[PDB]
Amino acid sequence: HMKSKLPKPVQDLIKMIFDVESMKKAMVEYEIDLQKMPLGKLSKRQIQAAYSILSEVQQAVSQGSDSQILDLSNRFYTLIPHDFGMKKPPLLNNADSVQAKAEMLDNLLDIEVAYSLLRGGSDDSSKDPIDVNYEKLKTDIKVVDRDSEEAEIIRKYVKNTHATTHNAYDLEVIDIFKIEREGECQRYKPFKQLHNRRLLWHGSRTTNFAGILSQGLRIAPPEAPVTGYMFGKGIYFADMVSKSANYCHTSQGDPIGLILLGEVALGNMYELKHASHISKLPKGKHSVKGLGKTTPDPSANISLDGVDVPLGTGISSGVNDTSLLYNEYIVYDIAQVNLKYLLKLKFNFKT
Ligand SMILES: O=C(N[C@@H]1CCN(CC2CC2)C1)c1cc(Cn2c(=O)[nH]c(=O)c3ccccc32)ccc1F
Structure with a gap:
């Protein structure tokens, strides 16, 4: 060949x-x-x-x-x-x-x-x-240059948002890819100027990425149980790299993982502390925020191509009786996600 x-x-x-x-x-x-x-x-x-x-x-x-x-x-x-x-x-x-x-x-x-x-x-x-x-x-995948500005921001987002309770490993960024699915920018057009657009993590096992790159991130189908997922049937993201990195399900026997960075249009967030198994949001709401006990520092937010990147180190959110240690972001319309980067991560397990 x-x-x-x-x-x-x-x-x-x-x-x-x-x-x-x-x-x-x-x-x-x-x-x-x-x-x-x-x-x-x-x-x-x-x-x-x-x-x-x-x-x-x-x-x-x-x-x-x-x-x-x-x-x-x-x-x-x-x-x-x-x-x-x-x-x-x-x-x-x-x-x-x-x-x-x-x-x-x-x-x-x-x-x-x-x-x-x-x-x-x-x-x-x-x-x-x-x-x-x-x-x-059906996805244009380019290698991001290591000397570039966007690479430095992405590495800093990985570097600053690794949670203390996930310290059994650390992450080496092996490769950073810029990705563009066919027609997704067209699908995202109604949400491209919406308030509270943030660059957030989504981790999954490597075996799901052919589906994610071909079809995009999808919502679980009508037949699926809404009670099977904490905040119901949507697309879940984190602002802590290690929280998403856990869902790669890597191990000592398989230490290389893949994680996404997506532009997610959150808008008016329906802020929740505990499980709420919903298929649709209340009128006026564009997303759910699962309120974390720990959050990235709001004052350290940085812009990357117009989108906010919450890459500050973890501080106390001042939220008391919550189920979640860290933030959680869910959208219930696939059109609210525009996938921007894909990182190949090496997990160095210290345990
Ligand atoms: O977004 C989720 N699943 C997608 C949506 C439906 N996708 C399967 C399609 C129907 C074939 C899987 C999802 C993820 C998780 C777990 N999860 C996860 O798998 N990866 C994450 O990055 C993540 C970040 C914050 C919170 C949870 C995360 C839990 C519940 C969910 F509905």
């Missing part, structure tokens, strides 16, 4: 996110049986069907015994086979179970998209498969 004239970092990005073995590895981490539910046998309607049964489990848990729950729990395991052998699998009878499986299904939707792109489209031996897979993302 031609050998590919993209930068080496962009080639390694494409290798990482289209890695089939990482997709398999992600599935067994959620206790899925690859023999009964292999990667190729995944589909949207079966994930959607499992979402609906989980919504039924949600309903039973909220209204109260193990007798009726058993049938709903077994229906779920029928749709998504789990690795338990000749089993009697664990009962899905609480909010934690709903949250845990809601997380699994989110990942399986994004894993399905990555695999469908891979096994879809054309096959040409003369082209480098790195270039072929790059084109499937």
Whole structure:
């Protein structure tokens, strides 16, 4: 083949996110049986069907015994086979179970998209498969220069917003990519001048990034249980890098992760202290802010291409009886997110 004239970092990005073995590895981490539910046998309607049964489990848990729950729990395991052998699998009878499986299904939707792109489209031996897979993302990915202004700001945002309670690792920025999804700037146009636009973090496991770069950050579908997510079905961001970096789910066995920086149009924020499982905001509100006990210093905010970057060091917010140690930002319209950068991070685990 031609050998590919993209930068080496962009080639390694494409290798990482289209890695089939990482997709398999992600599935067994959620206790899925690859023999009964292999990667190729995944589909949207079966994930959607499992979402609906989980919504039924949600309903039973909220209204109260193990007798009726058993049938709903077994229906779920029928749709998504789990690795338990000749089993009697664990009962899905609480909010934690709903949250845990809601997380699994989110990942399986994004894993399905990555695999469908891979096994879809054309096959040409003369082209480098790195270039072929790059084109499937519909996203212009450029390496950001390390001497540039935007690179310094991004490194400082990483450097200043690593929380003390997440100190079991630290982060090395390996690569900084400037990203532009096709048609997203067009989709963002109604929100481009809205007040309270902030550059915020979104972390996810590497196996979801083919989906995120192809489709954008999406909201969980109608079938998904709203009670599976703390502030319901939206797109969640943080202003602390380590809070988002935790959701990469890296480890000593897999220490390289990927994290996004997105321009999020927050507008009038519906500020909340505890769980509120909602599908729509109250009239007038553009987003939810989960109020953190700790927040970046407001006086240290810096502008990057018109957008605020809350890169101040963590200080006390003066918010008392809150569920959250750090800030949390949720939008419920996909059009309010314009993805700006993608960082490849090395996690150095001190423990
Ligand atoms: O935005 C979230 N999930 C996206 C939206 C639906 N996406 C799956 C699409 C349907 C295929 C996953 C989301 C994330 C999390 C966890 N999470 C997270 O995964 N990454 C973060 O950066 C993050 C930052 C602050 C707070 C939570 C974060 C929890 C609940 C959620 F609904």
